Amino acid sequence: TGGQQMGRGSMHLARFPRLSLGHFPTPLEVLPNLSAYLGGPTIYIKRDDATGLATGGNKTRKLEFLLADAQQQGADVIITQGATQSNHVRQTIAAAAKLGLKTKVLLEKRVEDYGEDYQRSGNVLLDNLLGGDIIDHLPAGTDMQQAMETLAESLRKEGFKPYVIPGGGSSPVGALGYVACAEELLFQSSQQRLRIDHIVHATGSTGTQAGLVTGLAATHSQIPLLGISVRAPKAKQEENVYALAQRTWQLLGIPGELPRSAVRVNSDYVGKGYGIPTEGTLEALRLLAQLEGILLDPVYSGKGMAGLIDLIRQGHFRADENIVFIHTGGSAGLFGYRQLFEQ
Amino acid sequence: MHLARFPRLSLGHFPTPLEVLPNLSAYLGGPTIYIKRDDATGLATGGNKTRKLEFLLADAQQQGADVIITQGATQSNHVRQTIAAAAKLGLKTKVLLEKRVEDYGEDYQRSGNVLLDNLLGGDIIDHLPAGTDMQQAMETLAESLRKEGFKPYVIPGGGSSPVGALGYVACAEELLFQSSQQRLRIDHIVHATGSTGTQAGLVTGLAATHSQIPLLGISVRAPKAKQEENVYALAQRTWQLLGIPGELPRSAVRVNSDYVGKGYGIPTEGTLEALRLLAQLEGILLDPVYSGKGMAGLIDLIRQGHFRADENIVFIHTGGSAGLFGYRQLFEQ
């Protein structure tokens, strides 16, 4: 293990407040049917879909640190934003409800296809059931951060103390949740005598990838990490992941600087844009469901898995290699896409 | 345990969490309510049926079965979990659905568990009229399949066979270990009771270990006496299969059927209120067919003074949240 230092990240993390909002650690499982079907490396799945928070997801880990921070500041209302079918919006509402706090939400009309179920089922239904206050549904292209800052400024004028959570929960505080996931994966792989040769996951607002690379580099773990973009091209996504990772690194008080080469993104699986699956996305959904009983989603985790599947099919990995795919969640979104599945 | 002797597959994430509900408990002003999170078994959005399938499919594998058959209503959670668990084993699942509910429009027919059934690759042979003898319909399908060379394993409705009930014999032990670990005196266990396997397994386990925790099933369809009769019968048979000596006390089986409402799959006002309160006080998703009725019973019994403030009640969340999407037309009203 050379100079690997498992727990150095946890040591820095220990000084930060954290609320209990999910079921951790999440399982690390082998996918034997998918592994045999593809004919290459052994594929393991880190089950961050199984965090327990209103059907679960990666955003649950970030919220444990974000909402602890909000409490430390005495916030009395939460503001966040996402696309119509955002999983982050749904998880924030549920977690804030557990704290007795209301969530004010701006949705963005990034996708206008897929009909009534896209507007009303899936995460929208859950948002409403969980009691979210959807203030507005804004045209695609809106600077959603600025719109939230204008709303927060109006609420402070009425005497509230809002806490603004950026899109996807991807602030340095939120990224701490995936620093902790990296330590969780290191500990599990140690307990299972599992050598992890690659970690692959879908990358969007960047907090998941930023936290993982911070935690891996802080522990001197030589595990390559590959982000499969869900929207942005490679260079722009890599620059944003790196900028957030170095801010997370600084927030944790880790000396020196993160290696830039640890940040790697593949943008070949974006397709036509955010929230639009390719045929390969839909194939990935079908394979995981019908070989492993696993529910992916057509926006995020389905594109991450389509990337992994395609890279395996192209011969990038040896059969004796082990890959950890992070299931970042999203299955609630499936019901928003019913019209597409029916064709 | 007498359970170690039985085959068991790993199909879910056990043990599931046992959590306090502090906002709900404060809201109602009575006992402390805890939740056993059997919605969080991990199998295609989760559910109680996952526990049963670990024993049922291990049995099917030891018998060399090469196809699975089961049945449920249109929005059945059991069907969805069976297809997913069987798919993890490389087995196909042939399914008979029953049109028990014909309200709530297109989303009830095509979203929710039906969409999941289709995504998961289930083979839905037919959609049969309400009142059809579904066990017989399955036996006919199986015999026809054997003629084509198959070795089917027929899972009864809800997976409520003695083999299936072993899953909740295991949950009882899990619950006792957790309460010992958490130093938690459990004064009452409450959950929604339907095809009977969950209640029967829990009853058998709590009695076998001489635990003295009372258990109340909130029926989702059948009247109290009929439900108690069926729960007791399956619990006795499960008691036999575990080869535990003697008989199960009849006083151990208690069902409350005041919360059925108009019938299976039709929520009451109390159900909708239970759904709203759990979601907005605790971030927890119940369902309008099962867990929401069970919680509605618990809330009403608390309001009627059945529990002291120093009692600790364990509500078993049996799952069902995937069915919420089948009921969108109701929530839009």
Side-chain angles (χ1 to χ4, degrees), chain A residues 127-155:
Chain A
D127 293 341
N128 289 334
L129 290 177
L130 295 155
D133 187 7
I134 299 175
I135 306 303
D136 211 335
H137 204 183
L138 302 173
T142 303
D143 183 343
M144 297 300 294
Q145 187 64 30
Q146 183 60 49
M148 280 188 306
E149 297 291 359
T150 302
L151 173 60
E153 170 182 84
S154 183
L155 289 177

PDB file of all heavy atoms in Angstrom, chain A residues 127-155:
ATOM      1  N   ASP A 127     -41.596  16.130  -4.581  1.00  0.00           N
ATOM      2  CA  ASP A 127     -41.390  17.488  -4.068  1.00  0.00           C
ATOM      3  C   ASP A 127     -42.650  18.004  -3.397  1.00  0.00           C
ATOM      4  O   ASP A 127     -42.592  18.600  -2.317  1.00  0.00           O
ATOM      5  CB  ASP A 127     -41.033  18.477  -5.191  1.00  0.00           C
ATOM      6  CG  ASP A 127     -39.690  18.228  -5.819  1.00  0.00           C
ATOM      7  OD1 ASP A 127     -38.852  17.541  -5.209  1.00  0.00           O
ATOM      8  OD2 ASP A 127     -39.479  18.727  -6.952  1.00  0.00           O
ATOM      9  N   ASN A 128     -43.792  17.820  -4.063  1.00  0.00           N
ATOM     10  CA  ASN A 128     -45.071  18.309  -3.558  1.00  0.00           C
ATOM     11  C   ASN A 128     -45.504  17.528  -2.319  1.00  0.00           C
ATOM     12  O   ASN A 128     -45.924  18.116  -1.313  1.00  0.00           O
ATOM     13  CB  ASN A 128     -46.126  18.205  -4.662  1.00  0.00           C
ATOM     14  CG  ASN A 128     -45.917  19.231  -5.793  1.00  0.00           C
ATOM     15  OD1 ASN A 128     -45.339  20.295  -5.586  1.00  0.00           O
ATOM     16  ND2 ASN A 128     -46.406  18.905  -6.985  1.00  0.00           N
ATOM     17  N   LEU A 129     -45.407  16.197  -2.379  1.00  0.00           N
ATOM     18  CA  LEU A 129     -45.747  15.365  -1.229  1.00  0.00           C
ATOM     19  C   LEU A 129     -44.933  15.746  -0.004  1.00  0.00           C
ATOM     20  O   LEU A 129     -45.460  15.804   1.117  1.00  0.00           O
ATOM     21  CB  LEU A 129     -45.516  13.891  -1.573  1.00  0.00           C
ATOM     22  CG  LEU A 129     -46.474  13.264  -2.587  1.00  0.00           C
ATOM     23  CD1 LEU A 129     -46.103  11.807  -2.895  1.00  0.00           C
ATOM     24  CD2 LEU A 129     -47.897  13.349  -2.061  1.00  0.00           C
ATOM     25  N   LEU A 130     -43.640  15.995  -0.197  1.00  0.00           N
ATOM     26  CA  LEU A 130     -42.755  16.350   0.899  1.00  0.00           C
ATOM     27  C   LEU A 130     -42.926  17.792   1.355  1.00  0.00           C
ATOM     28  O   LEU A 130     -42.242  18.203   2.294  1.00  0.00           O
ATOM     29  CB  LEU A 130     -41.304  16.104   0.488  1.00  0.00           C
ATOM     30  CG  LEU A 130     -40.881  14.653   0.204  1.00  0.00           C
ATOM     31  CD1 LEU A 130     -39.690  14.638  -0.731  1.00  0.00           C
ATOM     32  CD2 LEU A 130     -40.567  13.911   1.513  1.00  0.00           C
ATOM     33  N   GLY A 131     -43.781  18.574   0.697  1.00  0.00           N
ATOM     34  CA  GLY A 131     -44.078  19.913   1.172  1.00  0.00           C
ATOM     35  C   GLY A 131     -43.137  21.001   0.700  1.00  0.00           C
ATOM     36  O   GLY A 131     -42.993  22.020   1.380  1.00  0.00           O
ATOM     37  N   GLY A 132     -42.476  20.816  -0.441  1.00  0.00           N
ATOM     38  CA  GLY A 132     -41.625  21.869  -0.970  1.00  0.00           C
ATOM     39  C   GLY A 132     -42.437  23.054  -1.464  1.00  0.00           C
ATOM     40  O   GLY A 132     -43.549  22.906  -1.970  1.00  0.00           O
ATOM     41  N   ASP A 133     -41.873  24.250  -1.293  1.00  0.00           N
ATOM     42  CA  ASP A 133     -42.478  25.491  -1.791  1.00  0.00           C
ATOM     43  C   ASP A 133     -41.761  25.854  -3.089  1.00  0.00           C
ATOM     44  O   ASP A 133     -40.702  26.483  -3.074  1.00  0.00           O
ATOM     45  CB  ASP A 133     -42.372  26.603  -0.748  1.00  0.00           C
ATOM     46  CG  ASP A 133     -43.144  27.866  -1.137  1.00  0.00           C
ATOM     47  OD1 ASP A 133     -43.874  27.860  -2.147  1.00  0.00           O
ATOM     48  OD2 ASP A 133     -43.024  28.874  -0.421  1.00  0.00           O
ATOM     49  N   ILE A 134     -42.336  25.440  -4.216  1.00  0.00           N
ATOM     50  CA  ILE A 134     -41.778  25.749  -5.537  1.00  0.00           C
ATOM     51  C   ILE A 134     -42.190  27.176  -5.893  1.00  0.00           C
ATOM     52  O   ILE A 134     -43.340  27.433  -6.245  1.00  0.00           O
ATOM     53  CB  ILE A 134     -42.233  24.747  -6.599  1.00  0.00           C
ATOM     54  CG1 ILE A 134     -41.757  23.334  -6.233  1.00  0.00           C
ATOM     55  CG2 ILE A 134     -41.680  25.147  -7.984  1.00  0.00           C
ATOM     56  CD1 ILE A 134     -42.263  22.229  -7.178  1.00  0.00           C
ATOM     57  N   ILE A 135     -41.238  28.107  -5.808  1.00  0.00           N
ATOM     58  CA  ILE A 135     -41.538  29.522  -6.025  1.00  0.00           C
ATOM     59  C   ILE A 135     -41.790  29.808  -7.503  1.00  0.00           C
ATOM     60  O   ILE A 135     -42.689  30.583  -7.852  1.00  0.00           O
ATOM     61  CB  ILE A 135     -40.393  30.397  -5.478  1.00  0.00           C
ATOM     62  CG1 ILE A 135     -40.103  30.071  -4.018  1.00  0.00           C
ATOM     63  CG2 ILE A 135     -40.721  31.891  -5.616  1.00  0.00           C
ATOM     64  CD1 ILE A 135     -41.309  30.215  -3.119  1.00  0.00           C
ATOM     65  N   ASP A 136     -41.004  29.198  -8.394  1.00  0.00           N
ATOM     66  CA  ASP A 136     -41.029  29.566  -9.806  1.00  0.00           C
ATOM     67  C   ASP A 136     -40.430  28.437 -10.638  1.00  0.00           C
ATOM     68  O   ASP A 136     -39.713  27.569 -10.128  1.00  0.00           O
ATOM     69  CB  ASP A 136     -40.259  30.871 -10.049  1.00  0.00           C
ATOM     70  CG  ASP A 136     -40.822  31.695 -11.207  1.00  0.00           C
ATOM     71  OD1 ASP A 136     -41.470  31.129 -12.118  1.00  0.00           O
ATOM     72  OD2 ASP A 136     -40.588  32.922 -11.207  1.00  0.00           O
ATOM     73  N   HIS A 137     -40.736  28.466 -11.933  1.00  0.00           N
ATOM     74  CA  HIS A 137     -40.196  27.533 -12.921  1.00  0.00           C
ATOM     75  C   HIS A 137     -39.597  28.402 -14.031  1.00  0.00           C
ATOM     76  O   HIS A 137     -40.332  28.986 -14.829  1.00  0.00           O
ATOM     77  CB  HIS A 137     -41.297  26.599 -13.431  1.00  0.00           C
ATOM     78  CG  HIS A 137     -40.800  25.295 -13.979  1.00  0.00           C
ATOM     79  ND1 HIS A 137     -41.643  24.351 -14.529  1.00  0.00           N
ATOM     80  CD2 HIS A 137     -39.553  24.768 -14.048  1.00  0.00           C
ATOM     81  CE1 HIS A 137     -40.938  23.306 -14.927  1.00  0.00           C
ATOM     82  NE2 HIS A 137     -39.666  23.535 -14.652  1.00  0.00           N
ATOM     83  N   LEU A 138     -38.247  28.506 -14.077  1.00  0.00           N
ATOM     84  CA  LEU A 138     -37.627  29.583 -14.849  1.00  0.00           C
ATOM     85  C   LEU A 138     -37.137  29.096 -16.213  1.00  0.00           C
ATOM     86  O   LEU A 138     -36.790  27.922 -16.373  1.00  0.00           O
ATOM     87  CB  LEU A 138     -36.461  30.188 -14.067  1.00  0.00           C
ATOM     88  CG  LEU A 138     -36.856  30.740 -12.691  1.00  0.00           C
ATOM     89  CD1 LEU A 138     -35.632  31.166 -11.879  1.00  0.00           C
ATOM     90  CD2 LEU A 138     -37.798  31.916 -12.866  1.00  0.00           C
ATOM     91  N   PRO A 139     -37.111  29.983 -17.214  1.00  0.00           N
ATOM     92  CA  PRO A 139     -36.673  29.569 -18.556  1.00  0.00           C
ATOM     93  C   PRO A 139     -35.259  29.006 -18.549  1.00  0.00           C
ATOM     94  O   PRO A 139     -34.385  29.478 -17.821  1.00  0.00           O
ATOM     95  CB  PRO A 139     -36.751  30.870 -19.369  1.00  0.00           C
ATOM     96  CG  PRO A 139     -37.815  31.678 -18.671  1.00  0.00           C
ATOM     97  CD  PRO A 139     -37.620  31.369 -17.202  1.00  0.00           C
ATOM     98  N   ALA A 140     -35.041  27.985 -19.378  1.00  0.00           N
ATOM     99  CA  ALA A 140     -33.699  27.443 -19.571  1.00  0.00           C
ATOM    100  C   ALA A 140     -32.710  28.551 -19.916  1.00  0.00           C
ATOM    101  O   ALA A 140     -33.034  29.494 -20.640  1.00  0.00           O
ATOM    102  CB  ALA A 140     -33.710  26.395 -20.682  1.00  0.00           C
ATOM    103  N   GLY A 141     -31.492  28.425 -19.401  1.00  0.00           N
ATOM    104  CA  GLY A 141     -30.480  29.432 -19.583  1.00  0.00           C
ATOM    105  C   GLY A 141     -30.410  30.470 -18.483  1.00  0.00           C
ATOM    106  O   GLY A 141     -29.431  31.226 -18.434  1.00  0.00           O
ATOM    107  N   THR A 142     -31.418  30.545 -17.610  1.00  0.00           N
ATOM    108  CA  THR A 142     -31.352  31.459 -16.477  1.00  0.00           C
ATOM    109  C   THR A 142     -30.143  31.129 -15.610  1.00  0.00           C
ATOM    110  O   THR A 142     -29.854  29.960 -15.352  1.00  0.00           O
ATOM    111  CB  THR A 142     -32.632  31.361 -15.635  1.00  0.00           C
ATOM    112  OG1 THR A 142     -33.781  31.635 -16.446  1.00  0.00           O
ATOM    113  CG2 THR A 142     -32.591  32.349 -14.469  1.00  0.00           C
ATOM    114  N   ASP A 143     -29.417  32.168 -15.185  1.00  0.00           N
ATOM    115  CA  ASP A 143     -28.434  32.046 -14.113  1.00  0.00           C
ATOM    116  C   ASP A 143     -29.197  31.723 -12.830  1.00  0.00           C
ATOM    117  O   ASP A 143     -29.736  32.611 -12.165  1.00  0.00           O
ATOM    118  CB  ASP A 143     -27.626  33.335 -13.982  1.00  0.00           C
ATOM    119  CG  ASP A 143     -26.531  33.254 -12.927  1.00  0.00           C
ATOM    120  OD1 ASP A 143     -26.563  32.355 -12.063  1.00  0.00           O
ATOM    121  OD2 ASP A 143     -25.634  34.122 -12.940  1.00  0.00           O
ATOM    122  N   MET A 144     -29.257  30.439 -12.479  1.00  0.00           N
ATOM    123  CA  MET A 144     -30.082  30.035 -11.346  1.00  0.00           C
ATOM    124  C   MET A 144     -29.482  30.492 -10.022  1.00  0.00           C
ATOM    125  O   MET A 144     -30.231  30.778  -9.082  1.00  0.00           O
ATOM    126  CB  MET A 144     -30.290  28.518 -11.363  1.00  0.00           C
ATOM    127  CG  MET A 144     -31.043  28.013 -12.596  1.00  0.00           C
ATOM    128  SD  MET A 144     -32.694  28.712 -12.775  1.00  0.00           S
ATOM    129  CE  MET A 144     -33.543  28.034 -11.334  1.00  0.00           C
ATOM    130  N   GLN A 145     -28.149  30.593  -9.937  1.00  0.00           N
ATOM    131  CA  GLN A 145     -27.518  31.072  -8.709  1.00  0.00           C
ATOM    132  C   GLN A 145     -27.921  32.515  -8.425  1.00  0.00           C
ATOM    133  O   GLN A 145     -28.326  32.851  -7.305  1.00  0.00           O
ATOM    134  CB  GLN A 145     -25.992  30.947  -8.801  1.00  0.00           C
ATOM    135  CG  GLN A 145     -25.234  31.276  -7.490  1.00  0.00           C
ATOM    136  CD  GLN A 145     -25.535  30.302  -6.325  1.00  0.00           C
ATOM    137  OE1 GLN A 145     -25.824  29.128  -6.538  1.00  0.00           O
ATOM    138  NE2 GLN A 145     -25.464  30.804  -5.093  1.00  0.00           N
ATOM    139  N   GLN A 146     -27.849  33.377  -9.445  1.00  0.00           N
ATOM    140  CA  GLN A 146     -28.254  34.771  -9.264  1.00  0.00           C
ATOM    141  C   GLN A 146     -29.731  34.890  -8.912  1.00  0.00           C
ATOM    142  O   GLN A 146     -30.112  35.736  -8.095  1.00  0.00           O
ATOM    143  CB  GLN A 146     -27.958  35.593 -10.518  1.00  0.00           C
ATOM    144  CG  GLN A 146     -28.304  37.080 -10.355  1.00  0.00           C
ATOM    145  CD  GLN A 146     -27.523  37.750  -9.221  1.00  0.00           C
ATOM    146  OE1 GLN A 146     -26.298  37.626  -9.127  1.00  0.00           O
ATOM    147  NE2 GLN A 146     -28.233  38.456  -8.352  1.00  0.00           N
ATOM    148  N   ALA A 147     -30.584  34.078  -9.538  1.00  0.00           N
ATOM    149  CA  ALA A 147     -31.998  34.121  -9.191  1.00  0.00           C
ATOM    150  C   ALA A 147     -32.213  33.747  -7.728  1.00  0.00           C
ATOM    151  O   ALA A 147     -33.055  34.341  -7.046  1.00  0.00           O
ATOM    152  CB  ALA A 147     -32.805  33.203 -10.110  1.00  0.00           C
ATOM    153  N   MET A 148     -31.455  32.766  -7.226  1.00  0.00           N
ATOM    154  CA  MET A 148     -31.583  32.392  -5.819  1.00  0.00           C
ATOM    155  C   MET A 148     -31.061  33.496  -4.909  1.00  0.00           C
ATOM    156  O   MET A 148     -31.590  33.698  -3.811  1.00  0.00           O
ATOM    157  CB  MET A 148     -30.823  31.095  -5.513  1.00  0.00           C
ATOM    158  CG  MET A 148     -31.521  29.800  -5.894  1.00  0.00           C
ATOM    159  SD  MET A 148     -30.618  28.353  -5.271  1.00  0.00           S
ATOM    160  CE  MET A 148     -28.946  28.576  -5.893  1.00  0.00           C
ATOM    161  N   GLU A 149     -29.993  34.186  -5.322  1.00  0.00           N
ATOM    162  CA  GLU A 149     -29.463  35.267  -4.492  1.00  0.00           C
ATOM    163  C   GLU A 149     -30.436  36.434  -4.410  1.00  0.00           C
ATOM    164  O   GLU A 149     -30.509  37.104  -3.376  1.00  0.00           O
ATOM    165  CB  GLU A 149     -28.117  35.754  -5.029  1.00  0.00           C
ATOM    166  CG  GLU A 149     -26.979  34.719  -5.014  1.00  0.00           C
ATOM    167  CD  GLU A 149     -26.501  34.351  -3.607  1.00  0.00           C
ATOM    168  OE1 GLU A 149     -27.023  34.907  -2.612  1.00  0.00           O
ATOM    169  OE2 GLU A 149     -25.600  33.487  -3.495  1.00  0.00           O
ATOM    170  N   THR A 150     -31.165  36.706  -5.492  1.00  0.00           N
ATOM    171  CA  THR A 150     -32.183  37.751  -5.469  1.00  0.00           C
ATOM    172  C   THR A 150     -33.333  37.370  -4.543  1.00  0.00           C
ATOM    173  O   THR A 150     -33.841  38.203  -3.785  1.00  0.00           O
ATOM    174  CB  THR A 150     -32.686  38.008  -6.894  1.00  0.00           C
ATOM    175  OG1 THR A 150     -31.579  38.382  -7.727  1.00  0.00           O
ATOM    176  CG2 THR A 150     -33.734  39.118  -6.922  1.00  0.00           C
ATOM    177  N   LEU A 151     -33.747  36.102  -4.587  1.00  0.00           N
ATOM    178  CA  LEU A 151     -34.784  35.609  -3.683  1.00  0.00           C
ATOM    179  C   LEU A 151     -34.327  35.656  -2.224  1.00  0.00           C
ATOM    180  O   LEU A 151     -35.078  36.087  -1.342  1.00  0.00           O
ATOM    181  CB  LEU A 151     -35.168  34.182  -4.091  1.00  0.00           C
ATOM    182  CG  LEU A 151     -36.116  33.376  -3.206  1.00  0.00           C
ATOM    183  CD1 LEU A 151     -37.461  34.088  -3.088  1.00  0.00           C
ATOM    184  CD2 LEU A 151     -36.293  31.954  -3.773  1.00  0.00           C
ATOM    185  N   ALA A 152     -33.098  35.205  -1.947  1.00  0.00           N
ATOM    186  CA  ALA A 152     -32.567  35.270  -0.587  1.00  0.00           C
ATOM    187  C   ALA A 152     -32.537  36.704  -0.076  1.00  0.00           C
ATOM    188  O   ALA A 152     -32.890  36.974   1.077  1.00  0.00           O
ATOM    189  CB  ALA A 152     -31.165  34.660  -0.534  1.00  0.00           C
ATOM    190  N   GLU A 153     -32.103  37.640  -0.924  1.00  0.00           N
ATOM    191  CA  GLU A 153     -32.064  39.050  -0.536  1.00  0.00           C
ATOM    192  C   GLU A 153     -33.457  39.567  -0.197  1.00  0.00           C
ATOM    193  O   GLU A 153     -33.633  40.310   0.773  1.00  0.00           O
ATOM    194  CB  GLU A 153     -31.441  39.861  -1.672  1.00  0.00           C
ATOM    195  CG  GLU A 153     -31.509  41.378  -1.566  1.00  0.00           C
ATOM    196  CD  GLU A 153     -30.893  42.019  -2.806  1.00  0.00           C
ATOM    197  OE1 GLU A 153     -31.600  42.152  -3.832  1.00  0.00           O
ATOM    198  OE2 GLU A 153     -29.683  42.319  -2.762  1.00  0.00           O
ATOM    199  N   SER A 154     -34.461  39.171  -0.981  1.00  0.00           N
ATOM    200  CA  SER A 154     -35.834  39.541  -0.663  1.00  0.00           C
ATOM    201  C   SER A 154     -36.287  38.930   0.663  1.00  0.00           C
ATOM    202  O   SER A 154     -36.978  39.582   1.451  1.00  0.00           O
ATOM    203  CB  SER A 154     -36.751  39.112  -1.806  1.00  0.00           C
ATOM    204  OG  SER A 154     -38.083  39.523  -1.571  1.00  0.00           O
ATOM    205  N   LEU A 155     -35.891  37.688   0.940  1.00  0.00           N
ATOM    206  CA  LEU A 155     -36.308  37.048   2.184  1.00  0.00           C
ATOM    207  C   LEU A 155     -35.607  37.659   3.395  1.00  0.00           C
ATOM    208  O   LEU A 155     -36.215  37.787   4.465  1.00  0.00           O
ATOM    209  CB  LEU A 155     -36.055  35.540   2.114  1.00  0.00           C
ATOM    210  CG  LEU A 155     -37.010  34.799   1.164  1.00  0.00           C
ATOM    211  CD1 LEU A 155     -36.663  33.330   1.082  1.00  0.00           C
ATOM    212  CD2 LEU A 155     -38.446  34.978   1.614  1.00  0.00           C
TER     213      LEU A 155
END
